[PDB]
Amino acid sequence: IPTTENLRRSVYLDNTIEFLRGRVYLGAYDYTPEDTDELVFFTVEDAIFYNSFHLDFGPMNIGHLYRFAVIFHEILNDPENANKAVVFYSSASTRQRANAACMLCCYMILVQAWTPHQVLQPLAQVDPPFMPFRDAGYSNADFEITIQDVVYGVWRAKEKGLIDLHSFNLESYEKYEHVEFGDFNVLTPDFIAFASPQEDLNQPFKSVLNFFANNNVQLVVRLNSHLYNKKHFEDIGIQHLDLIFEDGTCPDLSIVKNFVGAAETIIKRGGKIAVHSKAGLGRTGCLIGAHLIYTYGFTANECIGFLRFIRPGMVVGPQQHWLYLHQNDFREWKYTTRISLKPSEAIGGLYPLISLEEYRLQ
């Protein structure tokens, strides 16, 4: 991302929202507006594409946002546009307007240090409203997250040091999200989420193995039935743990507590945890989401929004309501549990969460 002016009288356009007076606007048009001597318009809908699983349509992800930032800064830095207001626009559907609005908000949060109430004021009570974001599963939608949720989640993640666009590697991000290179994303400095490898090694499996070996993965957690031989991870010195539960279900809290204990053990030793389910989205979202809430105090909606900003489609169907209804439990564990000092066979000799009582006995 090239350097640009660090973010004049107002201009007034229909179907346009003012973000920065005289300089940054958000439009929605079903035609191509012509540039004037006072205005320059641009859209990324012809170049930046959300790849839907089913009926999910957004939000746009961190790689989309990074590419938007490059395109935006090139327009802002053009001497031709020195005394023009820049109008970022989308087509007029409520879904594409939601994507463009949320992506401009995430830009201002991550690149220009705006705060949530600053980026949300321009969008509040817009008529027609933006389409709320739905999950990626195949059932009828019954849980929505909003731009407010995504903005707060992305902002909180940035504040906690989980997002850093200065070190973000777009080419690595884009490569490894491909099915043929392993379908994974580095979610945070501590966590990778990935689709299960498959072994009848194929190219996606070797990509995962080499990336994991070179990027300090010290624990692989398997949440779905066996599609590969775990010996290949052990061959490169990475511990492998099963915490399997049924596709499309929510984990018993005992599973979540064991996962959080396992992850804490690995993090305190300075390693990453790579978690997979079949798709690396649903069951994986339940467990990593719980740990993020436990660690950083996200709301459930923020957590879902942040997770999908890095890896679209995480937390599927009823798992959304499950995360929502248990977010207090995950947060409460910081005060009601401790990392045990006895290893546990249930998590491969790592240290599980135990109550304050059993900790006093130890």
Binding site: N51, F53, H54, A136, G137, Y138, S139, V179, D183, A195, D247, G248, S277, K278, A279, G280, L281, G282, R283, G313, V316, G317
Partner: peptide, 8 residues
């Protein structure tokens, strides 16, 4: 159709 969706 209740499971995780397929990337493709």
């Amino acid at each position: 159709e209740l499971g995780s969706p397929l990337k493709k």
